[PDB]
What we know:
It is classed as growth factor. Keywords: growth factor. It forms a monomeric assembly. The protein is mainly beta. The protein has one domain (1-101): SH3 type barrels. The protein has strands at 3-6, 16-20, 39-47, 53-58, 71-73, 78-83, 89-92.
Amino acid sequence: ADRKLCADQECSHPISMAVALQDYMAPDCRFLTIHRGQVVYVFSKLKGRGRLFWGGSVQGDYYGDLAARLGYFPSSIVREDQTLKPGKVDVKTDKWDFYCQ
């Protein structure tokens, strides 16, 4: 049972913003990396069972490839400074769980 909190009621709003607390090269596709001095943007935090596994995306907007790829990583690897979460409703994940085709 992995439930994550949403920054709204119908899940249509950002959570907050955080910074990278150090380098953390994800395993391999399954997750995203996090290098020092690298800001991030949380979109969905999974707690109540997997607090160590949050959900969001890193800052930045590369050209010729808009819409960054969201990933999952612990909070310890980052530090939330700014916030913009209007809501905090829980959202249970599905059994499927697709990632990295």
